[PDB]
Amino acid sequence: KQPFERILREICFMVKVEGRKVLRDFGITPAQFDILQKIYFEGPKRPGELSVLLGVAKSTVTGLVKRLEADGYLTRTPDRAYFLVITRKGEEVIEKVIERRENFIEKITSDLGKEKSSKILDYLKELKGVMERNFSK
Amino acid sequence: KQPFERILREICFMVKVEGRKVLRDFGITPAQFDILQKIYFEGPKRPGELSVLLGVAKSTVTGLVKRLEADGYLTRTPDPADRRAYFLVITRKGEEVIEKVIERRENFIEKITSDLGKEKSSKILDYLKELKGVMERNFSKQ
């Protein structure tokens, strides 16, 4: 519950911010990255799915997507309905963020040693599985 | 490392989503909540800083903040060094929203730790404290 929630919130904040340090090199904004990673993970998205994700008006999504398309990170496919689809350039952004997060975790696994790292992974797997069972949809 | 990253990703996602389910009760959108939680944790923010944080134009920020101010979640205070500038600050009502998100997360984690049992939850908490510790030691790297 309490310290548990707080300690996990801090872990989640640090890993999030750590990965996003790579966006300093790309000039992709936080809202634009949110759009890219959602397409990366769930496939081609309709504009309304992005407005729900971000919590903004279509006009905001349209501006963000126009700029992403112009900068080669997104393209369109037909369904006169269209999905936004990520390009390889867009894919590499997400992959760099994941790599930076991975490497952050690698420093961690180094300071802990191999036996402890593997036990912590075993326990994280167990936590995740109990969490997934309790997670409503 | 790769499976370590993927497993933390899914853990963090589930607790994030679970906590944000309370926003439905308030009619607060994800971008609106991101403004409120930023101010909740870091204090007063200029409208330009909110624009940089969200990664949206100033016009979008204005629309988001105007609704939060009208509905009593945010208010405003002048910049004492510049008559032409102002800061957005959170109200009590705005705080209650963040507190209800945290409460929902605590309740979610309470069910998890109950399923795991006291002994295993303790072991896992010690490991997370260690992980948090090592992350803190490395979080300054640019």
- Alpha-carbon distance of B124 to B128, in angstroms, equals 6
Helix axes of A2-20 and A88-112: crossing angle, nearest 10 degrees: 130
Sign of CA dihedral B104, B106, B109, B111: negative
Q: What is the DSSP string of B29-97?
A: -HHHHHHHHHHHHH--B-HHHHHHHHT--HHHHHHHHHHHHHTTSEEEEEETTEEEEEEEEE-HHHHHH
Q: Chain A contact for B89, CB < 8 A?
A: no
Which positions ≥6 away from B58 have C-beta within 8 Å?
B47, B48, B51
Q: How many CB atoms lie within 10 A of CB B57?
A: 16
Record: contact B11-A106, CB cut-off 8 A: no
- Alpha-carbon distance of A102 to A55, in angstroms, equals 29
Q: What is the resolution of this structure in A?
A: 1.8
- Alpha-carbon distance of B137 to A23, in angstroms, equals 22
Record: contact B116-A133, CB cut-off 8 A: no
Among candidate residues A75, A73, A89, A84, the one with its CA nearest the CA of residue A49: A84
What are the boundaries of each domain within chain A? 1-137
φ/ψ (deg, to 5) at B24:
-65, -35
Pull the structure tokens for residue B85. 């500038």
Note whether A28 and A93 are within 8 A (CB): yes
- Alpha-carbon distance of A15 to B95, in angstroms, equals 25
Q: Of A18, A60, A127, which has the smallest distance from its Cβ to B60's Cβ?
A: A60
Method used for this model? X-ray
Record: contact A5-B105, CB cut-off 8 A: yes
Which positions ≥6 away from A70 have C-beta within 8 Å?
none
Largest CA distance in chain B: 58
**Which amino acid makes up residue A23?**
L
Q: Residue B99 is inside which H or E element, if any?
A: helix B92-116
Record: contact A105-B5, CB cut-off 8 A: yes
| CATH of A1-137 among 1.20.1250.20, 3.90.400.10, 1.10.10.10, 3.40.50.2000 | 1.10.10.10
Please list every residue in chain B whose beta carbon sits closer than 8 Å to the beta carbon of residue A93.
Answer: none
Please list every residue in chain A whose beta carbon sits closer than 8 Å to the beta carbon of residue B17.
Answer: 135
Note whether B1 and A106 are within 8 A (CB): yes
Domain B1-142: state its class: mainly alpha
Among candidate residues A18, A14, A13, A7, the one with its CA nearest the CA of residue A98: A18
